[PDB]
Amino acid sequence: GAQVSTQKTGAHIIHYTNINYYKDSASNSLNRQDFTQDPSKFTEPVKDVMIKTLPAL
Amino acid sequence: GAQVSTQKTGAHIIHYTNINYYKDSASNSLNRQDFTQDPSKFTEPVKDVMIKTLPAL
Amino acid sequence: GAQVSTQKTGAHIIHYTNINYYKDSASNSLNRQDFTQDPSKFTEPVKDVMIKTLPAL
Amino acid sequence: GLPTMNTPGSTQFLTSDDFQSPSAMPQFDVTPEIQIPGQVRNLMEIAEVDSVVPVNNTEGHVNSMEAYRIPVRPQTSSGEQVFGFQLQPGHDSVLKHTLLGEILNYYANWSGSMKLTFMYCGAAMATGKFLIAYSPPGAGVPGSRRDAMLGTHVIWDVGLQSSCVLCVPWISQTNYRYVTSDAYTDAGYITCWYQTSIVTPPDIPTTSTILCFVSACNDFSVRLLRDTPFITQQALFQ
Amino acid sequence: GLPTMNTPGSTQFLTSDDFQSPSAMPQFDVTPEIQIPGQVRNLMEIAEVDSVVPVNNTEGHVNSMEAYRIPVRPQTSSGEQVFGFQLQPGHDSVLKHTLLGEILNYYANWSGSMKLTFMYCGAAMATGKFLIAYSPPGAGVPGSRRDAMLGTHVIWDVGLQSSCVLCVPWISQTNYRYVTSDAYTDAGYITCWYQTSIVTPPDIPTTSTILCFVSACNDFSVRLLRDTPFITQQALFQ
Amino acid sequence: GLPTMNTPGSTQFLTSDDFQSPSAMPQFDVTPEIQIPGQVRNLMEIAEVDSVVPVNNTEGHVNSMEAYRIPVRPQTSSGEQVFGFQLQPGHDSVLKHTLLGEILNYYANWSGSMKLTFMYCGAAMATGKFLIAYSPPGAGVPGSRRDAMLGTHVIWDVGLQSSCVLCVPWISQTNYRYVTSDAYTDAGYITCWYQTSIVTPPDIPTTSTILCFVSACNDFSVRLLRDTPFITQQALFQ
Amino acid sequence: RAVGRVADTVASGPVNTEQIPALTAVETGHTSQVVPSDTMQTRHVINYHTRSESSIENFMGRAACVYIAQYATEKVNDELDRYTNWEITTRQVAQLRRKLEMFTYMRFDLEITFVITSSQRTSTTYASDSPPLTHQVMYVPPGGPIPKSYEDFAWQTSTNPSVFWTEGNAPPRMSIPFMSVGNAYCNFYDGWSHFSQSGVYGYTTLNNMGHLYFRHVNKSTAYPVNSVARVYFKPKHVKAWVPRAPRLCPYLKARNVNFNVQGVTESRNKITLDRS
Amino acid sequence: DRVRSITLGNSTITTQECANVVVGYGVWPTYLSDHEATAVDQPTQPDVATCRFYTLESVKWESSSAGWWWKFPEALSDMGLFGQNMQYHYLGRTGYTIHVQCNASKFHQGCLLVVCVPEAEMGAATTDHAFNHTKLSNIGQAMEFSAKKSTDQTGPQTAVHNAGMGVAVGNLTIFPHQWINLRTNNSATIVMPYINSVPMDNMYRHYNFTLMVIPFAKLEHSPQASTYVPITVTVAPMCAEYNGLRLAGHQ
Numbered sequence A, B, C: 001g002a003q004v005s006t007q008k009t010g011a012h013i014i015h016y017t018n019i020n021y022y023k024d025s026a027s028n029s030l031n032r033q034d035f036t037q038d039p040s041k042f043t044e045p046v047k048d049v050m051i052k053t054l055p056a057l
Numbered sequence D, E, F: 001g002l003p004t005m006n007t008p009g010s011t012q013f014l015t016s017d018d019f020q021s022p023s024a025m026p027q028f029d030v031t032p033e034i035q036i037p038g039q040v041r042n043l044m045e046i047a048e049v050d051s052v053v054p055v056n057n058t059e060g061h062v063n064s065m066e067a068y069r070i071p072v073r074p075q076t077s078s079g080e081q082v083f084g085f086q087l088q089p090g091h092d093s094v095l096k097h098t099l100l101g102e103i104l105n106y107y108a109n110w111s112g113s114m115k116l117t118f119m120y121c122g123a124a125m126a127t128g129k130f131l132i133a134y135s136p137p138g139a140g141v142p143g144s145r146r147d148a149m150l151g152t153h154v155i156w157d158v159g160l161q162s163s164c165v166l167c168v169p170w171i172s173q174t175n176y177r178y179v180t181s182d183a184y185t186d187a188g189y190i191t192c193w194y195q196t197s198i199v200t201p202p203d204i205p206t207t208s209t210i211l212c213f214v215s216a217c218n219d220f221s222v223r224l225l226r227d228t229p230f231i232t233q234q235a236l237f238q
Numbered sequence G: 001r002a003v004g005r006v007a008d009t010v011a012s013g014p015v016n017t018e019q020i021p022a023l024t025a026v027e028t029g030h031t032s033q034v035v036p037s038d039t040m041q042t043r044h045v046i047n048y049h050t051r052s053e054s055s056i057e058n059f060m061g062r063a064a065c066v067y068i069a070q071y072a073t074e075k076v077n078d079e080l081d082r083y084t085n086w087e088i089t090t091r092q093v094a095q096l097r098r099k100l101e102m103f104t105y106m107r108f109d110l111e112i113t114f115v116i117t118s119s120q121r122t123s124t125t126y127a128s129d130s131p132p133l134t135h136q137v138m139y140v141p142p143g144g145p146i147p148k149s150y151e152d153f154a155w156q157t158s159t160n161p162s163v164f165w166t167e168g169n170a171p172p173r174m175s176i177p178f179m180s181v182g183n184a185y186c187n188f189y190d191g192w193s194h195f196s197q198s199g200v201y202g203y204t205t206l207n208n209m210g211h212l213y214f215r216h217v218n219k220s221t222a223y224p225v226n227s228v229a230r231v232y233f234k235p236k237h238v239k240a241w242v243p244r245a246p247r248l249c250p251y252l253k254a255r256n257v258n259f260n261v262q263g264v265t266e267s268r269n270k271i272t273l274d275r276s
Numbered sequence H: 001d002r003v004r005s006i007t008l009g010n011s012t013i014t015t016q017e018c019a020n021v022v023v024g025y026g027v028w029p030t031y032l033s034d035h036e037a038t039a040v041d042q043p044t045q046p047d048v049a050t051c052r053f054y055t056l057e058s059v060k061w062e063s064s065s066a067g068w069w070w071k072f073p074e075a076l077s078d079m080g081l082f083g084q085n086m087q088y089h090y091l092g093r094t095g096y097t098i099h100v101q102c103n104a105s106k107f108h109q110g111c112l113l114v115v116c117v118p119e120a121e122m123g124a125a126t127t128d129h130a131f132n133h134t135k136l137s138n139i140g141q142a143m144e145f146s147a148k149k150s151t152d153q154t155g156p157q158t159a160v161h162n163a164g165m166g167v168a169v170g171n172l173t174i175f176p177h178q179w180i181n182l183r184t185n186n187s188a189t190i191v192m193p194y195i196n197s198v199p200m201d202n203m204y205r206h207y208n209f210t211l212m213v214i215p216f217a218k219l220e221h222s223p224q225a226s227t228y229v230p231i232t233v234t235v236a237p238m239c240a241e242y243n244g245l246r247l248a249g250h251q
């Protein structure tokens, strides 16, 4: 039940092991490595699509 | 002798590992995840079956 | 995710195990066993090659 | 040795822990268990059993069997009220020492539907109809039988089957209500009214008796264990 | 037992740790999550939304809606300046309480391009051209419209589309600038100038209004979390 | 828990340890490295570069460029000595502030062959021969050119190639010598003598100049890191 | 390209087009998606930057002090009593409160860590010899029997979760799951507690998290000792919805959002820049 | 394009200069799912007698106008059978189509922000004092901001640059918004979904969202033009459903 995952490294021996010790999922560590996002709920929440090159009106 | 089991999580990385260290079963941890039940010993302990829709007498 | 590597021994049971515990690569230990080198950037940084046996001028 | 490091929380006693510990009696031969009848694997098996409710608990009546006896009688006009209480199954004085109410006071959250059973304990020659109503908590208490006919209700015809069940549904905006009451998680009111009357032949006593039973339905659940505010002690019992 | 040895750092509280710890409520049944709209998974979704900039913040104007209203009018000669501020999106007084500026004050490093949007809020019969310029920080402030035409700039023609976007590019020697400003990571200046004038027909007010909006581009990133120097307290709030 | 036991050495700070430790900045995005020229992966790349030796360091000459200028001149008789120093590349005053000598003072043991390069900086019309000799440390210092011709030596003919290399071989009974000198690991002597003379045409200055360079060979190695006895401080630099 | 990595910019040349990416309309509610490649000539840059530090888990996952609890081994008054309590809230400190109030609804698990420290009270003498102090931090769920004094029966903690800690060791730490009776923790509640629109206005009616009682389980000391326990909340497994505007004004109370009126930003003397 | 027609029930909105439609957080309103419900009784869904357009009273826009706010669903407490269903039910749930409309001329100038703020919890004008609910919102009356601070002993803090919430008024553009710029824009329509942390709620003790209308560029014109411009708000509920039938409330 060991989860070997990728460590946070830079860009131009890179793995860590995790064992879960407790029977509750609230006892687990933080989910540091989850970087998913979609900003279209806030920046472009209009009904008809608005292409950049075309005039807005 | 590792027992990988399912952690307690909610509803809409979820496993834990356990090693037993001692030679007595009374040394073990609690059985937290056993939710079996049958309440018909107390709520309906009559000899003849009683269907809900039918009259009781 | 165990990396078994060669221990530093002399010349005339020689291995160690490493587990990474943390999610950041800056949390790792030192890279002690990296002895690569190339001194030609400093000792012989000339454009035309200079053979030892031949005259330099 | 193996290089280790100690996290926060070392050398503590958290009383709701789950850790292994060595045995003081090693290789102790425990006696074999047998089939004893009535095994309990859950406190929700206990809470799903009927338990008679002291609706008549206006003291001095709590120090006798008069607390369980809801009185009814023949009426001069119809539509009067028989009884009424708030639906607080862990906080209201009518329901908090019942068998469902005592389990809920070990917990802080409750959820699910409930069953109020009623039992007419009058003479077999006496007839009657009743309206038992549940009101969601928004408008206030119902003031009449006209106010009570607008919510969840049932009309009970007293006949050969002496009992009727008003099922109190779970109509809430949260998934859990609190056992100790507050205004955010208020659950409403239970009232009972004369639908018609009690009509008897001659040579029969006037006042009859209705018994109210509470139990939990099969979607009932509890949460967040706590200490009950019912037992106290100032010193160790010697 | 297993032979162990304790490294430096045992029995410490590092507040940015990541360790497991036992539960005080074991087997607690957490309520199911539902679809709530507007979920945020990153603070860069918040910073990429337009937020109107108080360019007119010369007090007393900050205590009213006059702080957001950049005034323009018909001119006697052309090429005069409308406004100007330093491009310090976490330190300059014009940009540090905007919605992009408030996220950056939780961080110490920022990187990426920005979008300055402008919005002409005058009458539909009034026309105009404007030059909005960005200057890299080497030479100093531009002194005229001739000095500003040498850097990154855009000429905006006020017409049926009321808005124009000046895109401020990331022209830096480092991959990150600092949020609290210094001279090593200076980012430059933003100025606006009259390209032509405001020309109106009769029976129209003289002064018009331009609104400036800031947001981040899709290559924007922040780094090195810190406390913000904006909220303070001398005691616990009771 | 898992039964453990603590060995000697727990809760200590050994400054040359190698242990993991948690991060104060979790998930910090480090900037990408680029190709910078001149990367150093070993201090033996630095020590294998020539560095001019102050052989003429008789004060007052160390406070000027006269320390590097070994003087030669036409002679009245041949076989006289030009210079001489002990081969202690980390302890002798001639070699311990050179670029090879400064790396060795961080270490306690050194091993390998060395290269002494010489450079005649006189006029192109002046000729000359020289004998540069290395003596193993058993007999003492050579007293003449006859005493020096018995050890490892080279005769250098000054011509179109201005430089000659005396290679000092590793002739030792141990695999390592000590950087701070002692009598058990003595390495010997370096001397230079007039093989013939300096012969010049007329209208040429008498005294010429020879520059001595030191570097390490490709079998050179160092061992046992230490603090250098060259930098000191009595208080913290404010 | 990996998840969380920013976009590259593409090489763009000169244009003379009928396309107008610079001209837009703010009136539509739309934030324009203009890249620097659209309004000027750019080069091809391979951007390797990541949005790691800006995640909701990374922005929130640092422990912040939420309460300072004081109690002594000898009562002065009921503020420096033998025991003390704290209604669990996140609004008494300003640093964590401003970070949580950037969202309307959140849903997280907690880590509570205590930094308990003692100090000898000012006296005419201090020369004593005392055994190490041990503390109890009992959690009482909403509606349970609270300690009415020291030596109380309610500290028997048969069903309440307790922790015990002797001074000198590592700080105590436990994990708390998501505890709301709804589907999210409400940072804001625009409403009342009673149906007649009266009673308590605000988020106070949606915060029934219970109390946290502190004491010394040692019976006595030779000379009185004052303790201070700092409570540290670190949220983990964080979800968040409906991002709020950041707060301008400082806080005044813990149960309100009441403020004093302040300007929108700091000032300057003129709207232009005047050098060369 | 600039034309748009919105039909809900027996009511139609036509607009000849429309900017666009802002849809919430990208979510269209819908009925509650079976895997998200809590109450067990059958809901009632009056599809056309409630999900129709209800127009409010106009407000006069002046040069010295600071702004107005409406709190919902309490703004429609008496609007037909939407108001009759609130009184008879404990729980309710709905999304909205807010349509704000204001035309002036090609010779006027001004700009209005139209934000929909979920849980716009307002502070008190006089602090250390709880305020009355009729100062927060009357039944359909437009509660209005002020240019300077309020010293009302039982009212909200109506200074408009702090927006009643202690925040900067310029940062309200993360909430679902449009702008009515009189140069180009005639109306502004926002479709809001149901935003709450619970699947249904009581529609009297809780203001789910607040509609604010704020002049950022103030109204100015020639004195010989029309000196009266009104601002009308037309709101349609969407997918409204109810639970917990009892007597008429609402105490």
Ligand SMILES: CCCCCCCCCCCCC/C=C/[C@H](O)[C@H](N)CO
Residues within 6 Å of the ligand: E024, G088, G089, G090, G100, G106, G110, G112, G136, G137, G138, G139, G161, G162, G163, G174, G176, G179, G185, G186, G187, G206, G207, G209, G212
């Ligand atoms: C002595 C053992 C102590 C055990 C500690 C248990 C206390 C924690 C239980 C309640 C947790 C409440 C978490 C608080 C969340 C915030 O109030 C929300 N952000 C606002 O609703």
